[PDB]
């Protein structure tokens, strides 16, 4: 039950941010909506830092690990919104930005995950 509250409190703040960031920014560049991208890059960053930091704190309450990762970063990022944007571009014959949106999201989120991981890795060393 306490684990359930971690996902709800964390997921709500993640979804709220994604909603606010997407409505305010997605329309500024429809070929690659920057609000859906930032929340994914920002979630990959949080999950990367959490990956390295939690490894060095094995006695942290799983409550906090759960609220940040499964909740906050989970609700902040989105895969469905990333898909309709790509799907709509493919339907609009806009093939070059459908492919570009796939690379920037995937390559970017992984890079943001590595940055978050290696920055905490280096700071402790």
């Amino acid at each position: 039950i306490k684990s359930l509250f971690a996902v709800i409190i964390g997921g709500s703040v993640g979804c709220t941010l994604r909603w606010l960031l997407s409505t305010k920014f997605n329309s500024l560049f429809p070929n690659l909506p920057p609000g859906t991208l930032v929340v994914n890059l920002l979630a990959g960053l949080i999950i990367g830092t959490a990956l390295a930091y939690f490894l060095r704190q094995p006695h942290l309450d799983p409550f906090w690990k759960l609220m940040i990762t499964t909740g906050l970063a989970g609700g902040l990022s989105t895969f469905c919104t990333f898909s309709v944007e790509v799907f709509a571009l493919l339907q609009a014959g806009n093939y070059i930005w459908a492919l570009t949106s796939v690379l920037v999201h995937v390559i970017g989120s992984l890079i943001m995950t590595a940055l978050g991981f290696f920055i905490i890795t280096i700071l402790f060393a």
């Binding site: 409505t23 329309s27 429809p30 859906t36 309709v84 944007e85 609009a92």
Partner: protein, 96 residues
């Protein structure tokens, strides 16, 4: 708050029985445009057809000489809040 309606709908070239219309794409992901046309005097059926979202011009054929036509263009676009939806149309009158 970005408008999904096309702008500057206009006949750029004309014959007595055909028209070349063009318009300016709106600042949204337009999946495809829809072009409607019919005789302005509302005593004629309206016809519609689609063009891909990458094209911003269209040809209307099979028309009658010396007749007033109402030509409208609206978009089937993607936005974040509304997913797919149809926009309000931009309309012009033209006499062949």
């Amino acid at each position: 708050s970005v408008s999904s309606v096309p702008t500057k709908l206009e006949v750029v070239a004309a014959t007595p029985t055909s028209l070349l219309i063009s318009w300016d794409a709106p600042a949204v992901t337009v999946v495809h445009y829809v072009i409607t046309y019919g005789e302005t005097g509302g005593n004629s059926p309206v016809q519609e057809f689609t063009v891909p979202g990458s094209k911003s011009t269209a040809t209307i054929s099979g028309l009658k000489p010396g007749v007033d036509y109402t030509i409208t263009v609206y978009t089937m676009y993607y936005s974040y809040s509304d997913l797919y939806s149809y926009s309000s149309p931009i309309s012009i009158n033209y006499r062949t």
